[PDB]
Amino acid sequence: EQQPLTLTAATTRAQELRKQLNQYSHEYYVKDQPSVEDYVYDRLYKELVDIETEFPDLITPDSPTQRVGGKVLSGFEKAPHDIPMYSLNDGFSKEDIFAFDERVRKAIGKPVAYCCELKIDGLAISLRYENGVFVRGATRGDGTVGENITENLRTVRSVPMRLTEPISVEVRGECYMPKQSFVALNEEREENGQDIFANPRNAAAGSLRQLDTKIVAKRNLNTFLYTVADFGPMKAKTQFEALEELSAIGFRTNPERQLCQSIDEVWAYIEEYHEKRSTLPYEIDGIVIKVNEFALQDELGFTVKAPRWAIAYKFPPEEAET
Numbered sequence: 001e002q003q004p005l006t007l008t009a010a011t012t013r014a015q016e017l018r019k020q021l022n023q024y025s026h027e028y029y030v031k032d033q034p035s036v037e038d039y040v041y042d043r044l045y046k047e048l049v050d051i052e053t054e055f056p057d058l059i060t061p062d063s064p065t066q067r068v069g070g071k072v073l074s075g076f077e078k079a080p081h082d083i084p085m086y087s088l089n090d091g092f093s094k095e096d097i098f099a100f101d102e103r104v105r106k107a108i109g110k111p112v113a114y115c116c117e118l119k120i121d122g123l124a125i126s127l128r129y130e131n132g133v134f135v136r137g138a139t140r141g142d143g144t145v146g147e148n149i150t151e152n153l154r155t156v157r158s159v160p161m162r163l164t165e166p167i168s169v170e171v172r173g174e175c176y177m178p179k180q181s182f183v184a185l186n187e188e189r190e191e192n193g194q195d196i197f198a199n200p201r202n203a204a205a206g207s208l209r210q211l212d213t214k215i216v217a218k219r220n221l222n223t224f225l226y227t228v229a230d231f232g233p234m235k236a237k238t239q240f241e242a243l244e245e246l247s248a249i250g251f252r253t254n255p256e257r258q259l260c261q262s263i264d265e266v267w268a269y270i271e272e273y274h275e276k277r278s279t280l281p282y283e284i285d286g287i288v289i290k291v292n293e294f295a296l297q298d299e300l301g302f303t304v305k306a307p308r309w310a311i312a313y314k315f316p317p318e319e320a321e322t
């Protein structure tokens with residue numbers, strides 16, 4: 001009648017199971033290419049649950065079992081941003097974008113390649129990892145102080161609990177509610193006699209600011225990550241490389257990015273994705289254009305208000321394109 005696992009055996013097995021389950025979840029949710037059928041995942045997940053039940057000391061805050069929600073907070077602690085979450089200067093016309101390029105070429109003294117990305121219209125987030133483990137999730141707030149929504153973000157399945165390497169990094173991006181989920185949610189709320197959300201951004205914000213993680217877990221949220229606060233522990237020397245590296249270590253990144261060699265190529269990208277906007281399952285409010293080379297970003301630096309190496313081209317509001 002003796003239990004099969006010792007504490008040390010249970011500890012090692014739990015570690016193995018967590019690594020495997022984190023991999024499978026990444027494949028299933030982020031790659032959208034699961035290597036195993038659901039029954040395989042479910043089987044290993046149950047084994048972990050049973051270990052954690054028998055040995056509660058082995059439960060880690062980042063374990064796959066901590067994803068499902070249930071915890072309820074009394075309030076959100078403030079979440080300072082030691083490195084500010086800056087906002088970009090905006091452009092609205094072809095003139096604004098070509099003028100930006102002219103200013104960049106003036107400062108650098110040669111043509112400059114640009115990493116072009118979609119500007120995801122959701123809730124800006126910062127994800128802190130310590131030795132490869134998710135330890136803090138925060139909203140942007142005013143860019144200097146946000147809200148600690150760590151537990152809520154654990155329920156968002158695209159957020160990795162562990163990275164492929166044990167690095168410490170502060171990763172920034174957006175969390176959003178897909179358009180199809182938003183419309184469904186609003187109908188559910190209508191039927192419940194609840195106030196509807198004005199748009200998917202408010203719906204994502206409402207969801208991430210719920211104190212009851214069980215409620216948050218029921219909502220459909222996703223993420224795209226595109227930068228870090230400090231590239232010190234990263235190998236990347238360009239923004240395009242940085243996106244590849246973030247994807248490699250386990251973050252969901254947006255696949256529509258393109259490296260452009262001239263501002264004329266940047267313009268074509270802007271035109272391309274204005275047309276593609278309606279076909280995407282997530283909202284965008286424009287296009288972000290960044291000098292690709294980190295060396296050149298460093299040279300350009302920031303003004304008091306924003307980077308001198310990037311601009312956001314703003315499309316008309318989503319509401320103006322039905």
Ligand SMILES: NC(=O)c1ccc[n+]([C@@H]2O[C@H](COP(=O)(O)O)[C@@H](O)[C@H]2O)c1
Binds near residue numbers: 025
């Ligand atoms: N096939 C897989 O690798 C895989 C990974 C994660 C979740 N799932 C499925 O998603 C559902 C929920 O699982 P989780 O709450 O652990 O994310 C279950 O039906 C599970 O089978 C499947």
Ligand SMILES: NC(=O)c1cnc(N)c2cc(Br)sc12
Binds near residue numbers: 088118288
């Ligand atoms: N891909 C990007 O750079 C990007 C996407 N979506 C956003 N809301 C933002 C905001 C800043 Br600041 S950058 C950025």
Ligand code: NA
Binds near residue numbers: 156216221
């Ligand atoms: Na969810």
Ligand code: NA
Binds near residue numbers: 274275276277278279
């Ligand atoms: Na369209």
